[PDB]
Amino acid sequence: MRSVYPLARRSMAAYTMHNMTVPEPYDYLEDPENPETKTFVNEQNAFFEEYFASEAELRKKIFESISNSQDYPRTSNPSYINGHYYYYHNSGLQNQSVLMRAMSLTDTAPSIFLDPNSMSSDGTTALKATAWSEDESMLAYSLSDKGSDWQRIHVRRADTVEDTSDVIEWAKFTAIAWWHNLGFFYTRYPALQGDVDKGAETDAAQDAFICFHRIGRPQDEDVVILSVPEHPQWNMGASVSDCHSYVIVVLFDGCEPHNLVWVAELPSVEKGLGSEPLVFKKLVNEFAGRYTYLGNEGSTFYFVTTRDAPRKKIVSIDIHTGQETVIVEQQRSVLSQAALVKKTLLLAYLEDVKDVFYYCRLEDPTLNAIPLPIGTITSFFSDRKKDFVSFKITSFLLPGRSFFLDINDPQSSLRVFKDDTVEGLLVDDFVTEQTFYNSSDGVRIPMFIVYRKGSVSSESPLLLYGYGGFNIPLTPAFSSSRMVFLRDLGGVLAVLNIRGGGEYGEEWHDAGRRACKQNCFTDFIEGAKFLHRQGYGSPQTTAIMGGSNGGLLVAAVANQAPELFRCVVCRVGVLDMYKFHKFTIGHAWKSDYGDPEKEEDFRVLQQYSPLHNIKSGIKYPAILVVTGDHDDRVVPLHSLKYVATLQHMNPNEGGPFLARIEVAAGHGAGKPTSKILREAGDIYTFIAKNINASWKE
Numbered sequence: 001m002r003s004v005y006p007l008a009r010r011s012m013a014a015y016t017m018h019n020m021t022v023p024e025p026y027d028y029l030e031d032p033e034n035p036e037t038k039t040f041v042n043e044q045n046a047f048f049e050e051y052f053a054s055e056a057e058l059r060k061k062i063f064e065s066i067s068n069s070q071d072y073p074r075t076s077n078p079s080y081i082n083g084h085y086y087y088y089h090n091s092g093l094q095n096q097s098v099l100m101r102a103m104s105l106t107d108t109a110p111s112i113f114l115d116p117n118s119m120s121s122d123g124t125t126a127l128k129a130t131a132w133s134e135d136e137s138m139l140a141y142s143l144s145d146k147g148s149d150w151q152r153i154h155v156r157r158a159d160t161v162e163d164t165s166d167v168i169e170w171a172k173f174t175a176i177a178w179w180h181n182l183g184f185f186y187t188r189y190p191a192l193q194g195d196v197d198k199g200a201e202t203d204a205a206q207d208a209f210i211c212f213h214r215i216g217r218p219q220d221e222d223v224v225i226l227s228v229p230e231h232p233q234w235n236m237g238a239s240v241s242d243c244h245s246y247v248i249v250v251l252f253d254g255c256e257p258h259n260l261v262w263v264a265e266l267p268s269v270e271k272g273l274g275s276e277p278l279v280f281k282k283l284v285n286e287f288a289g290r291y292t293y294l295g296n297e298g299s300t301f302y303f304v305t306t307r308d309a310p311r312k313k314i315v316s317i318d319i320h321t322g323q324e325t326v327i328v329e330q331q332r333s334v335l336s337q338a339a340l341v342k343k344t345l346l347l348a349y350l351e352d353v354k355d356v357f358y359y360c361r362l363e364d365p366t367l368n369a370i371p372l373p374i375g376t377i378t379s380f381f382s383d384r385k386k387d388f389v390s391f392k393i394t395s396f397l398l399p400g401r402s403f404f405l406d407i408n409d410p411q412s413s414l415r416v417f418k419d420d421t422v423e424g425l426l427v428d429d430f431v432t433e434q435t436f437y438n439s440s441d442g443v444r445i446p447m448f449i450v451y452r453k454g455s456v457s458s459e460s461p462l463l464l465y466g467y468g469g470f471n472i473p474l475t476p477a478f479s480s481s482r483m484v485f486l487r488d489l490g491g492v493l494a495v496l497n498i499r500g501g502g503e504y505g506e507e508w509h510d511a512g513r514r515a516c517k518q519n520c521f522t523d524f525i526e527g528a529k530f531l532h533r534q535g536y537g538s539p540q541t542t543a544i545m546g547g548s549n550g551g552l553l554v555a556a557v558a559n560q561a562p563e564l565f566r567c568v569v570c571r572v573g574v575l576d577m578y579k580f581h582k583f584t585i586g587h588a589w590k591s592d593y594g595d596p597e598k599e600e601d602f603r604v605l606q607q608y609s610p611l612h613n614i615k616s617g618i619k620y621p622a623i624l625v626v627t628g629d630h631d632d633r634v635v636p637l638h639s640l641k642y643v644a645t646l647q648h649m650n651p652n653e654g655g656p657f658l659a660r661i662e663v664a665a666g667h668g669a670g671k672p673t674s675k676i677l678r679e680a681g682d683i684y685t686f687i688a689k690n691i692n693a694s695w696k697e
Contacts, residue, residue, distance in 0.1 A: 002656055003050065006043035008647045009036050018602055022578055022612065026644035029637045030202070030583075032629065037640075044643070044659045051656065052685070059685040061695075065488050066681050067093075070480045070673070072422040077379050077390040077402050078105065082136035082158070086113055087402070095123030095672045105404070105417065113161070116143060126670025131176035131184065134244070138215070140184055142174040147630045147666025148199025153186070155215070168219060172205070177240040177247075179266065183214030183273070185225065185238045185247065199632045202583040210238045210249065214273060223274040226262075233587060242384045243296050249280070250291070254591025256513075257306070257471055257506070258287035263319050283319050289506070295340040295384050302327070304338050310507035314338065314345065328365050334505040336475075339382040339389075341407045346389065348377050352434065353446060353475060353497055355393075359410060370410045375401070376475040390417065395476035396450045396493070397427055422483075429453065430486055432476075437530045439523050445499070447527065448476065449536065451492035461489060461693040462537040464528060466496030468512070468520060469549035470592060473503040481680040489688060490696030492536060498523045498553075514594050514601060518608050524557045528564055543567030543687045547668065548634060549574060552610070555623065555642060559613045562620045562654070567690050569683060570625035572667060576638040577609045583635040611638075614645050620654030624686050626679060628665030636661070658686065 014023040028034050052059065074097065076088035085105060088097040096117055102110035119125035128151055130141040142153040153168040153176070170192050178184040189208045209227035213219060226249055228234065236251040249262045262280040269275070284291055289306030296302065299320040304312055312335035314328035333351035343362045348355045355377045358367035375393040378400075382389055390404040400420030406413035430452050436444040463485055467474045474495055485491055497503035500512020500520045512520050528544065531537035544565060546553050551573025558568055580586045581596050594601030606612075614620075625643055627636040643659045650657070660682065665675055 002652050003047060005647050005657070006040055006047065008040065008644060010648075017578065017596075018599065020606070025648075026641055029641050029644065032200075032637070040640075041661050045661065048658050048660055051658065052682075055685065055689050058688065058695075059681065062484065062488070062685055062688070063678070063681040066481060066484045066677060066684070069422065069424075069484050069488075070677060072399065072420060074400065074420055075100075075402055075418045077381050077392050078102075078404060078417060079381050079390070080383075080386060080388040081132060084158075085110075093673060095674070096126060096670075113158075114141065114156070119143070120145060122664075123672050124664070124666070126666070128670065129174045129176060131178060133178050133181065135181050138178070138181070140176045140178070142171065142176065144670060146199065146664065147628065147670065148197075149632045149667070150199045166215075166219075168213075172208075173235070173237070175237045175239070177238055179212070179240050179247075180244060182270075183212055185210065185212045185240060187211075187237065188222075197630075199630055201632075202635055204583070204587055205235075205585050206232055208235075210236060212273065221274065225278065226280070235588065239293060241296055243298070246296070247278075248293050250293070252290075252588075253287060255470060255588035256591030257290040257509070259290050260285045260287060261291050261293070263301070281319065283317075294338060302340055304335060306506045310510070311335070311505040314347075328360065328367070331367070334502065336473075337377060337380050339380070341382060341384055341386070341389070344407055346382075346407070348380070348391075350473060350475065350503070353448065353473065353503055355475075370414065372403070372414070373398070373401075376477060378477070394420070394478045396432055396448075396478060396482070397430060399425075399478045425483065425487070435534075437526070439499075439526050441499075445523065446497055446503070447530075448495040448497075449492065450486065450494070451536075452486060452490060455490065456492055456536070458532070458535045459538045459541050460536075461491035461688075461691050462494065462531060462542045463491060463687070464494045464496065464531070464537075464542065464544040465546060465550070466498055466524065466527070466544075466553065467546055467548075467550035468496070468498035468501040468503075468553065471502035471506070471509045473497065473501050481684055485684060488696060489684075489693050491693060494527075494531065494536075496524065496527045498527075513592060515604060517594070518604055521553060521556050521560060521608065524553055525561055525564065539564060540566055541691055541693075543569075543691060545569045545571070545683075545687075547571045547573070551625075556608055556610045556613075558621060558623070559608075559610055562618065565621045567687050568621045568623045569687070570623055570639060570642065572627055572631060572634045572636070572639060573625070573642075574634060574638060575642040576611045577605050578611065580638070583637075584632060586635070611642055611645065614649050616649050618654075620646075620650055622654075622656050622658070622690050624658040624660065624683065626683070627659070627661045628667065629661065629663050630665065631667055633667040633669070 010025040011027045013027045014021055028036050071092040074090045078085040078087040085102045086099050089100045090097045098115045099113035100110040101113040116125050116127050124146050125143050127143050132139055140155045142151045144151045151171045151174050155164050155166050170189050176184050176186055187210045211222050211225045213222045234251050234253050239248045247264045250259045252259045261284050263283045264278050264280050292304045294302045299318055301319050302316050305315050309330040311330045313330040316327045317324040333349040336350035336355055337348040339346055344359050346359045348357050357370045357372050360367045375395040375398050377391050377393050379392045387407055392402050394400040399422050402418040404417045432450040435447045439445050498520050500509055551570045554568050594605050596602050625639045627639045646657045
């Protein structure tokens with residue numbers, strides 16, 4: 001039977017919130033440094049290993065398989081700068097990608113340009129952002145250490161290939177924007193105090209500002225550019241115009257996709273940098289949508305906006321007079337990407353969760369379609385004055401294709417640059433398909449199903465995945481672990497585009513936000529049940545999984561119909577809605593989650609609260625949560641807090657309940673290859689063990 005679970009401490013503390021007393025027997029989970037939390041972590045992982053030793057040999061086996069399936073050169077898009085082509089590349093097992101600088105597109109011997117590999121001994125360092133100078137003799141990159149979101153900016157000059165002594169500290173969400181050959185604009189957070197480990201505190205983000213630092217001088221001469229006293233809680237970012245005359249600042253309230261944008265002039269006087277504060281024209285100052293900037297032509301200013309257009313729309317707004325005129329009206333599709341070069345505008349549309357590429361000149365805005373194989377655009381490089389464009393397109397079948405193009409006439413210039421081919425894999429062994437199934441709304445929802453052609457039955461192992469949050473659509477994308485699942489385990493993968501995502505744009509998220517948030521979970525239920533009525537899945541042979549908010553989905557749907565699932569995993573997921581507003585950047589999450597002060601919002605929040613909604617005496621599936629000690633993007637405590645209830649809530653019925661907390665790890669952005677590979681291997685061994693899906697030889 002199930003072994004004796006670790007003796008969890010029970011805390012008497014109970015707090016009253018909106019005239020409702022919530023007890024909390026695990027408050028000591030706030031501080032990771034407490035002895036109780038550390039001993040509980042150690043015991044939980046010891047029992048995890050004891051459970052897993054039953055099929056540790058299969059663990060090693062599929063570890064070997066995933067390692068052999070991960071070994072391929074991952075080449076990204078080329079960048080054309082100063083007659084040299086810089087593109088990311090990996091040997092396949094090296095911890096981080098390294099830049100390649102080639103003299104030509106067809107060059108055989110490109111040299112290394114940027115190498116994060118030797119930065120840290122364990123390779124924990126991850127490159128986060130980069131930016132270019134207009135004279136192509138300067139670039140500024142920004143990385144992070146120990147998986148902590150707190151970053152560090154370094155600067156390098158191309159020709160000498162040497163570092164510089166300038167470094168910056170405690171920076172988050174870095175947006176470098178250089179101005180001619182003098183300096184660059186960035187954002188910086190208030191100075192931290194104490195001896196706490198970097199990125200190892202729960203303090204909420206506040207009192208940050210954007211500023212500008214010039215080269216040749218220390219950080220001490222940095223002059224504050226913009227800081228808002230009226231709204232301390234908002235986030236904001238800066239951007240330099242390619243016309244080299246104006247600076248654009250964008251302000252978001254929380255994480256919800258509305259912003260107000262301010263345009264300012266720039267003085268050519270060197271002393272003016274630090275002489276007087278810069279004025280700000282009130283271009284848009286009310287939250288009507290996300291008014292992203294694309295490019296400007298003199299007085300004219302082109303933006304992709306959601307105002308008066310739920311599916312995104314390209315509009316030209318003159319800032320010297322204040323008139324607004326629409327130039328590219330919204331089609332029935334949703335804009336995934338857009339850019340403006342010379343006279344043409346090239347737009348990638350996420351139509352039916354498929355990117356179709358269109359180009360339209362300023363004369364006739366007819367979006368003319370340029371052929372491109374089915375897939376999903378991941379990265380996109382573009383420069384207004386340049387004549388070379390490139391993008392990587394990948395999906396479930398395609399492991400990645402770097403494709404370049406000429407803006408002047410794509411009619412005969414679309415060419416293949418590189419392919420991320422993986423040995424021992426064939427396209428014909430698998431096939432994907434779209435499906436439409438009706439939810440309670442009476443409106444069809446799309447879903448993707450990828451499966452190996454041939455043997456597929458209702459009892460075959462099923463994995464179902466869907467994120468659906470923050471207006472990020474779960475577009476098709478390759479995964480080595482997914483391919484190991486597909487080919488080595490003979491199962492079928494399915495991806496849900498649930499309501500509330502950007503899969504249909506702003507209206508979809510608007511319908512799936514705040515008061516109707518619970519609605520999305522109901523949809524997920526139908527998803528799995530539909531796969532059982534179509535003949536693709538059986539309740540004893542299904543597993544669903546997701547990350548962060550998607551991980552949320554899993555646990556919360558387990559509260560609705562636990563017996564409708566059998567295998568469930570959580571991964572750095574938000575679970576403690578009662579206190580999610582307090583710690584980390586969760587305050588921005590309120591803009592998508594309901595502000596807990598508002599009573600009508602706390603009604604639904606307490607309705608679906610997965611930390612407390614779990615009930616005893618009812619069967620539950622086996623949850624496996626994964627966390628890391630240095631998790632600042634999401635506070636790790638919430639996840640363990642979830643397990644904290646189950647330990648006492650189900651003595652020997654349901655589960656089993658696994659918590660894998662890995663020492664010295666990240667969040668998911670910049671994970672070292674060894675650690676992420678080991679974690680994926682363990683996750684898939686667990687889902688195979690609790691599904692009984694033998695080796696598909």
